[PDB]
Design a protein around this ligand. Structure first.
Ligand SMILES: Cc1nn(C)c(C)c1CC(N)=O
Length: 165
């Protein structure tokens, strides 16, 4: 199962890890992707997860968008986890670099509550432009299911742990 995690709360755990390497090692039931409404997995966690699937995630995602249209900011969809997990929960957090409402980050984390355990990144952090300390706070105050957070950047991981209330 999950190893080397620091316990933050009853249900939130955190580790300085590459989420792709973590997924390949654990092969969890659910890996969360930091998706955009179009499921265009270009950069950040999405680009890295998609690249690990040899673009199979993008092919599947384009078929999903052709049938269903775009997701909502704060919304999600469950697709295949390919070689990384049983399922991938594509969750759209607000992108602050696109003027999206930061209040939608709580709605985005509510999607995690439909899954008993998840491997996930911090929503809206990184190239999405939100403060990762705020994202972790919304995560622990919103998610009630077991979430194992993978934070790629060591310096950010240390800052998140040392500032966690
Ligand atoms: C992979 C990966 N794992 N995690 C947690 C992040 C933020 C990434 C994105 C990247 N390094 O391209």
């Amino acid at each position: 199962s999950f190893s080397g995690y620091l316990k933050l709360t009853d249900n939130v755990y955190i580790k300085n890890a590459d989420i792709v390497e973590e997924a390949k090692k654990v092969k969890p039931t659910v890996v969360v992707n930091a998706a955009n409404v179009y499921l265009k997995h270009g950069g950040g966690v999405a680009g890295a997860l998609n690249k690990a699937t040899n673009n199979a995630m993008q092919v599947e995602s384009d078929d999903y968008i052709a049938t269903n249209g775009p997701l909502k900011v704060g919304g999600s969809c469950v697709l295949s986890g390919h070689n990384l997990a049983k399922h991938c929960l594509h969750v759209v957090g607000p992108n602050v670099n696109k003027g999206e409402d930061i209040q939608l980050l709580k709605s985005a984390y509510e999607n995690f509550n439909q899954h008993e355990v998840l491997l996930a990144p911090l929503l809206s952090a990184g190239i999405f432009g939100a403060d990762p300390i705020h994202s972790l706070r919304v995560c622990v105050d919103t998610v009630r299911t077991n979430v194992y957070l993978a934070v790629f950047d060591k310096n950010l991981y240390d800052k998140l742990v040392s500032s966690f209330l």
